[PDB]
Amino acid sequence: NHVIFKKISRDKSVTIYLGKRDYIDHVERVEPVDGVVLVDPELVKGKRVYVSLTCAFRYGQSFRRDLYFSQVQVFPPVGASGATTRLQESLIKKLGANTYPFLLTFPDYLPCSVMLQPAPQDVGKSCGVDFEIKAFATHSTDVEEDKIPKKSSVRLLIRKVQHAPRDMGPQPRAEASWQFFMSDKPLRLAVSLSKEIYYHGEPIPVTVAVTNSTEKTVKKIKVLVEQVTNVVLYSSDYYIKTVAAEEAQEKVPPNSSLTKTLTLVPLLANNRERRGIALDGKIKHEDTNLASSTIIKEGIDKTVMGILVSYQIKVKLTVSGLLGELTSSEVATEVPFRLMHPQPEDQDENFVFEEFARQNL
Amino acid sequence: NHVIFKKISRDKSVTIYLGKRDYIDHVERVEPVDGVVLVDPELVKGKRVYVSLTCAFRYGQEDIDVMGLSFRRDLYFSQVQVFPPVATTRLQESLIKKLGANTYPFLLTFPDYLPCSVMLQPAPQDVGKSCGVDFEIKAFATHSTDVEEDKIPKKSSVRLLIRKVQHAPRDMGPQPRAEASWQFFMSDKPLRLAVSLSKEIYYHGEPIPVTVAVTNSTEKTVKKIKVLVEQVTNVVLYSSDYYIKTVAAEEAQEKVPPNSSLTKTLTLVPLLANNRERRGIALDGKIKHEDTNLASSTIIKEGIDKTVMGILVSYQIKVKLTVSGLLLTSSEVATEVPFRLMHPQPEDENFVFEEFARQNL
Amino acid sequence: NHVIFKKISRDKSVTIYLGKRDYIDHVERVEPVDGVVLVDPELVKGKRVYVSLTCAFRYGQEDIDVMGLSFRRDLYFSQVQVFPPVGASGATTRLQESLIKKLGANTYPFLLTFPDYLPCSVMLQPAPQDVGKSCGVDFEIKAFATHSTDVEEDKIPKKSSVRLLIRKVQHAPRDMGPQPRAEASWQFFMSDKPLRLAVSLSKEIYYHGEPIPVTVAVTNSTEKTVKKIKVLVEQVTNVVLYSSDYYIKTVAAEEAQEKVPPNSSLTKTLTLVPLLANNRERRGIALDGKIKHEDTNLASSTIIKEGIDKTVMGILVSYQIKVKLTVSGLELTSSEVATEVPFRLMHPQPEDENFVFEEFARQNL
Amino acid sequence: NHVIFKKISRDKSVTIYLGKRDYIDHVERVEPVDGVVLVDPELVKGKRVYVSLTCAFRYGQEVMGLSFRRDLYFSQVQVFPPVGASGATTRLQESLIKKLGANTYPFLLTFPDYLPCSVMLQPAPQDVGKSCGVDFEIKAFATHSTDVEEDKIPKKSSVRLLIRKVQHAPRDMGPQPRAEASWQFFMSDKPLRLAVSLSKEIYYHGEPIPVTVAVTNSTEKTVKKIKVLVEQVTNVVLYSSDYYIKTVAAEEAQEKVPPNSSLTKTLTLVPLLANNRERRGIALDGKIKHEDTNLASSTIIKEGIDKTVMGILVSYQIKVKLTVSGLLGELTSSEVATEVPFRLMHPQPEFQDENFVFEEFARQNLK
Numbered sequence A: 001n002h003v004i005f006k007k008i009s010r011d012k013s014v015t016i017y018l019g020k021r022d023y024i025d026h027v028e029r030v031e032p033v034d035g036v037v038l039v040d041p042e043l044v045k046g047k048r049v050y051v052s053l054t055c056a057f058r059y060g061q062s063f064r065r066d067l068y069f070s071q072v073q074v075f076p077p078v079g080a081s082g083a084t085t086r087l088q089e090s091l092i093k094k095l096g097a098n099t100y101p102f103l104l105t106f107p108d109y110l111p112c113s114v115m116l117q118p119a120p121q122d123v124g125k126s127c128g129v130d131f132e133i134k135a136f137a138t139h140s141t142d143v144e145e146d147k148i149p150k151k152s153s154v155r156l157l158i159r160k161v162q163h164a165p166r167d168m169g170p171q172p173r174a175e176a177s178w179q180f181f182m183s184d185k186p187l188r189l190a191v192s193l194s195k196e197i198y199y200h201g202e203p204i205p206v207t208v209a210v211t212n213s214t215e216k217t218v219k220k221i222k223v224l225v226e227q228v229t230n231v232v233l234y235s236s237d238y239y240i241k242t243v244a245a246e247e248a249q250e251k252v253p254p255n256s257s258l259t260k261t262l263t264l265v266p267l268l269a270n271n272r273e274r275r276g277i278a279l280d281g282k283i284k285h286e287d288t289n290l291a292s293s294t295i296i297k298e299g300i301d302k303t304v305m306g307i308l309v310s311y312q313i314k315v316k317l318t319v320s321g322l323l324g325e326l327t328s329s330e331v332a333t334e335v336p337f338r339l340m341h342p343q344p345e346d347q348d349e350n351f352v353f354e355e356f357a358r359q360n361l
Numbered sequence B: 001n002h003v004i005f006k007k008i009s010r011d012k013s014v015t016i017y018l019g020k021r022d023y024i025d026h027v028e029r030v031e032p033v034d035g036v037v038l039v040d041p042e043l044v045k046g047k048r049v050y051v052s053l054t055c056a057f058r059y060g061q062e063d064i065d066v067m068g069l070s071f072r073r074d075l076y077f078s079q080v081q082v083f084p085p086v087a088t089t090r091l092q093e094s095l096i097k098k099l100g101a102n103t104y105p106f107l108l109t110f111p112d113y114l115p116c117s118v119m120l121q122p123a124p125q126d127v128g129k130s131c132g133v134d135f136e137i138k139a140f141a142t143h144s145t146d147v148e149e150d151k152i153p154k155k156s157s158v159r160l161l162i163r164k165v166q167h168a169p170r171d172m173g174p175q176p177r178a179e180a181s182w183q184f185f186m187s188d189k190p191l192r193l194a195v196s197l198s199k200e201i202y203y204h205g206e207p208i209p210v211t212v213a214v215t216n217s218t219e220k221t222v223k224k225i226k227v228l229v230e231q232v233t234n235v236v237l238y239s240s241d242y243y244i245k246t247v248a249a250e251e252a253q254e255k256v257p258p259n260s261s262l263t264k265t266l267t268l269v270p271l272l273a274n275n276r277e278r279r280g281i282a283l284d285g286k287i288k289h290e291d292t293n294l295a296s297s298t299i300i301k302e303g304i305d306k307t308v309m310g311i312l313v314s315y316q317i318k319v320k321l322t323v324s325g326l327l328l329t330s331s332e333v334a335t336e337v338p339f340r341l342m343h344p345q346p347e348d349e350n351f352v353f354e355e356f357a358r359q360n361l
Numbered sequence C: 001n002h003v004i005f006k007k008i009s010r011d012k013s014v015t016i017y018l019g020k021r022d023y024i025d026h027v028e029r030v031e032p033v034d035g036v037v038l039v040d041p042e043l044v045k046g047k048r049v050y051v052s053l054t055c056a057f058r059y060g061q062e063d064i065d066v067m068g069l070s071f072r073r074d075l076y077f078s079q080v081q082v083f084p085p086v087g088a089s090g091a092t093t094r095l096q097e098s099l100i101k102k103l104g105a106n107t108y109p110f111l112l113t114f115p116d117y118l119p120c121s122v123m124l125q126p127a128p129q130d131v132g133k134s135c136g137v138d139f140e141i142k143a144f145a146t147h148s149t150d151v152e153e154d155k156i157p158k159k160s161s162v163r164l165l166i167r168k169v170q171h172a173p174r175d176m177g178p179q180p181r182a183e184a185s186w187q188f189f190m191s192d193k194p195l196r197l198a199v200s201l202s203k204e205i206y207y208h209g210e211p212i213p214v215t216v217a218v219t220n221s222t223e224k225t226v227k228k229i230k231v232l233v234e235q236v237t238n239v240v241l242y243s244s245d246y247y248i249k250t251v252a253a254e255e256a257q258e259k260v261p262p263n264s265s266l267t268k269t270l271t272l273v274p275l276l277a278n279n280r281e282r283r284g285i286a287l288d289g290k291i292k293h294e295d296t297n298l299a300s301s302t303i304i305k306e307g308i309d310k311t312v313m314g315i316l317v318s319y320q321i322k323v324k325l326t327v328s329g330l331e332l333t334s335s336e337v338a339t340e341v342p343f344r345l346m347h348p349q350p351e352d353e354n355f356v357f358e359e360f361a362r363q364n365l
Numbered sequence D: 001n002h003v004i005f006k007k008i009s010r011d012k013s014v015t016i017y018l019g020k021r022d023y024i025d026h027v028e029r030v031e032p033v034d035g036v037v038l039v040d041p042e043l044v045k046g047k048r049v050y051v052s053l054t055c056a057f058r059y060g061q062e063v064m065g066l067s068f069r070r071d072l073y074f075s076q077v078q079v080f081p082p083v084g085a086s087g088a089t090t091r092l093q094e095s096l097i098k099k100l101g102a103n104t105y106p107f108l109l110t111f112p113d114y115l116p117c118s119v120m121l122q123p124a125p126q127d128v129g130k131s132c133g134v135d136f137e138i139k140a141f142a143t144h145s146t147d148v149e150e151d152k153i154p155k156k157s158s159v160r161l162l163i164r165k166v167q168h169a170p171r172d173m174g175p176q177p178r179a180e181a182s183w184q185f186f187m188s189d190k191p192l193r194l195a196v197s198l199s200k201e202i203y204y205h206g207e208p209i210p211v212t213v214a215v216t217n218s219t220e221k222t223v224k225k226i227k228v229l230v231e232q233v234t235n236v237v238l239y240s241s242d243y244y245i246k247t248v249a250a251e252e253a254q255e256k257v258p259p260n261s262s263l264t265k266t267l268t269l270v271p272l273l274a275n276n277r278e279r280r281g282i283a284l285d286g287k288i289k290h291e292d293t294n295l296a297s298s299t300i301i302k303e304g305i306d307k308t309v310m311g312i313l314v315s316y317q318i319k320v321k322l323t324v325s326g327l328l329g330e331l332t333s334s335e336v337a338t339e340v341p342f343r344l345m346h347p348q349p350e351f352q353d354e355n356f357v358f359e360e361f362a363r364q365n366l367k
């Protein structure tokens, strides 16, 4: 029972059909955009119809940087005009004779859907990476120029979604250690995660091991998921935001050890305040999540990613008779990990047609 | 013509002003940190702003897919309340008088037992990790439930990374020459090597005149004479790391045949400029800053454990003689002469506000 | 019926005899090495036989296709002439006089004393998961013959020399004032509710083979349950020459499956005997001799004398009782608190004849 | 111009011909023994002729059967009467049969991968432990029947050749041999440091070994002598546990190292039997009296093969010994030295009939 996403040009001459709103990047390769265009043959008589795939970084409401552009012709028909995917072949049978397939590939050097609308707190403007599928018609009423009317066009803002690769990094571990002014004995903090990659909505078990050899009490153990956003085109904007926090019930008294697993799930739903954090879509959309971790490929300059998003676990220890007397600094350590969507899973179908426009809240 | 260094907090509730970036250690005493904090009495209502001096030794860098490993020891901490207030200096009264009645003063003094600004980022060849001694001036604001728990807001605080720079003391006695001699017996016949420096204590930028006397009563020929300034770095907290780096060199290739005797004075200037590779070398600041120099000779006051200095930096002149006569596989003999390297001694109204940020190269 | 230990040269010229394989350090003083050298004057014609005592810290192991790396520091050296006799070792001792008779006037005495600033026999061989290398403190008694030339050349003949690896064994001092109970308590507040843990031992000093009664007193005023109580004897080893190597290893363990639910307390006495015999894996832990030898035990606690830099002990050995309480959630997964009580582990206080003769070579397994 | 080694039996019935005296082991594989037997057809009528290859460890002799013996390999083929096609397998066999005539029969005896190379040792007066060695014997012999159902193997109808299995180097090599030793003497706060490196891990008999020594002398004592040795180590691992360590090359540096100085120097050594007056007490690949005898090559043990079936283990190592002023007698009764292991062996190996010259197999003596 396959849901097909459709949108029609104002002048009803061009209709575009897509199998998905969201196209999978799993590092090794990126799922191509395979769709079809239905033309009104009376309204495109003498005209040409193309489909473009554009990736561009934007900043303000001001600045724009194209990261990728590709374009194919659907009308008049090109060569055999036969589909390459079953989804196309099936949509052509279902929709009829005025149905032409397009395939637009993704390269490997592009980022995934990431955008950020600042909070009042924050300096630096709106920015993001958009992916646009546009079908449009060109025509000529005079030999001096071709024209591209908007009314004959239809654009879909698709998402490039980060799904997990085959392999995974080493088990994240961190060991931090402190001697406070006039303390002979150290405070020791070890932190481990079960694995290096976590899926959106998967619980993260943070194992904390506090060895307190000091004469002071560890009053509080706090664990955060911090999101770190580096805008790396146009403006060098930096955001670090808590997207999950768990405070332990336990203190660690003098000359004692405590090992403890706190579980956090970093989710957009956790944050009432959705501005000031890297999302994979607009705040107003229902299907908007936290941005997945950026995966910079070998040899690719990080600046062409536009916005860098990473995640870390911050473990903060509150120590008795410290803040005000022996330090004005926090006692903390951080452990990197990557957040993204799950590994992708390895006759004709039955098609339901829906508006492309994403459901709001 | 007095450049004052200013930095303003995130929320603009607290602004700090210092006389200097760099504070002079001349062994006898260390010049204190006197400055003022500018407040916004609205955003500072029901609050008490503090200023702290922290000296910390830190060890451990950030490596991707390597266990995060970190050590910090606070070698000194000290705090004073700047607002509401409770002697004074000309520069305090002057800045007060020239800024407003929102400017309140602070004086933080250094004890005698701290090292000077020393830090180190390793080279690919090197096994140890990044480490350094940092000096932080932090002005921060707190509420009444900021002492009921331990929370000091990130945005109502500003920090300056000042240097503690090693200068020679004021009224030093006359210095003997740094010198040693060696007799290398070859077939029971002496090759006498004498190395002499004009003095013991040289300044950064000061040419070092090295006198080398080779008296050859051997059947062998001295085919090559090389003269180095070597920096020796010993990390003495957390990890027993050892660095020995040429920071100046002169290869003479002047021959000294049998029953002959050659004296030669070379001039070397140990400078950070002399080498592209600023890694694997003890510096007084970050590699990327222009005002950063080679670290000065560590000075250990008697009755102080060398370990509390964190990183021990020393300088020596190394002389390598290449010797042959066998047929041909040549031997190399080497000796060193220690010397101390630091900044020159010191002696004994109108403002242009610069931002504390240090210029890059 | 006193057993005497004998070893002979390759050239069968010089043969050495000792009262013991092992010499007692009891903190107040160390037992001196009194022995005799039998040498047939035929095969040492116009030579000088000497006996030396060497204490050496050593570091490094042989690995195929791995750079050879070794360190040696000599912590003590002393030498006496035995042939031809002078008053080299002062007055003889009861054992020397008695041994002279039994082996004729080819037999000559020696006395080498230990100073007070030395460690005791400690050595370690790393386990697969250990970062550091083989290291130990060895004690060598060497009897060796030399000519007027041999000293100048640096050529003491290995043929006309014999060496013994003796042990310096840590016994408790004769004079001990009755010992207090080694005890402590902690309060692990959980949601501002105390989980009181008290640990106590009968005394502070235990002997090898002696059972250690650990008394554990959990007072649970929390809303959580102590699911498990684990009690370990941990040996802690710090190599303090050449390379700062760290070993912490379980040498005895008792895991008691006891619940301690809210508004409930539990007192409990587990008895542990830390012994090398408990461990299949004899690597990764401080011993007083080689793994191969059967007389090899766990290293005794290092005793640092007043005004001695601990670095000249080479290897620091200490023992602790670790108590681990596994504690429930309110569940998903469970926490774990842990404390330590230090104790010292060493050998008990110290206490004409017929002589049986034996080889020095220690019995293997 | 290929030299062919031959020996004829006392009774003149059996003559054996070999291409070489010495067969190459290069780790990967071992050269087989390919040869021929010339029979006198009158003298082998109703007789069977065989060729055996035997590898045996012995200890005691080198009469009465008073020595310990352990066999490591035995193979035997038949050459007469003719077996199957009776045709050559190698070009050397084809050529010899052509040259020698119709009474010439080929034999091929192969070597497995689990055997040592030629090693033997006659002790010196200073050594306890007796003569021992690994022998390789090629024996061609004739059997015949008697009427009382007892076959006979007369010594007069046999020819023994004592061949050598010679170790040549494999295609690969171990990493550059390096060693770092340091010493802190009693009452010293300063280390004496010695670093030793060799150019490579495998050297060839006759090849100069460049031993690079770096002495860092941070002490107040003088290094008055640097001695570099090639030591040969021999463990007999069958019957008796005899251990030998002998200097087979020695250089003494002319340089002393004064207090608070460092010296880097490369000494060159050639471990050669030639340079050894005393040929007893060291591991050789043959008899002392023979001219073609050399130092035994390093034993190369194969993964899974118990070392005891090598009979004699031979290894080599550089020893750098430092003589320190006023140390020996005052501060130590032990030597100041480090060892670097290396392996010693022979170099790597790689349309018309050959022209043959025949010589007695008997190896030339020293004279």
Ligand SMILES: O=P(O)(O)O[C@@H]1[C@H](O)[C@H](O)[C@@H](OP(=O)(O)O)[C@H](OP(=O)(O)O)[C@H]1O
Binding pocket: A154, A155, A156, A157, A158, A282, A356, A357, A358
């Ligand atoms: O009319 P146009 O020029 O095509 O532009 C549309 C417009 O920007 C809508 O706001 C947007 O929907 P949202 O506000 O919900 O993002 C839609 O995205 P869509 O193509 O994904 O429906 C765009 O196509």
Ligand SMILES: O=P(O)(O)O[C@@H]1[C@H](O)[C@H](O)[C@@H](OP(=O)(O)O)[C@H](OP(=O)(O)O)[C@H]1O
Binding pocket: B159, B160, B161, B286, B356, B357, B358
């Ligand atoms: O944002 P914060 O909390 O102030 O911290 C700044 C941060 O650590 C920068 O890496 C550092 O860069 P530079 O050393 O290159 O300037 C700067 O040094 P600074 O204090 O010397 O400006 C710090 O202030």
Ligand SMILES: O=P(O)(O)O[C@@H]1[C@H](O)[C@H](O)[C@@H](OP(=O)(O)O)[C@H](OP(=O)(O)O)[C@H]1O
Binding pocket: C162, C163, C164, C165, C166, C290, C360, C361, C362
């Ligand atoms: O033959 P040498 O040169 O005297 O050296 C002996 C050799 O190192 C043995 O391996 C060793 O026995 P272990 O391996 O059993 O220790 C013995 O020590 P010992 O005193 O324990 O017999 C040493 O004396």
Ligand SMILES: O=P(O)(O)O[C@@H]1[C@H](O)[C@H](O)[C@@H](OP(=O)(O)O)[C@H](OP(=O)(O)O)[C@H]1O
Binding pocket: D007, D159, D160, D161, D162, D163, D287, D361, D362, D363
């Ligand atoms: O009479 P047999 O049983 O053949 O025994 C031969 C005899 O022992 C020779 O002395 C020996 O030569 P060396 O004295 O030179 O060792 C020869 O070796 P070879 O024929 O293999 O050379 C032996 O085969």
Ligand code: NA
Binding pocket: A052, A053, A054, A132, A133, A134
């Ligand atoms: Na487009």
Ligand code: NA
Binding pocket: A328, B052, B053, B054, B136, B137, B138
């Ligand atoms: Na501070």
Ligand code: NA
Binding pocket: D232, D233, D234, D244, D245, D246, D281, D282, D283
């Ligand atoms: Na040998």
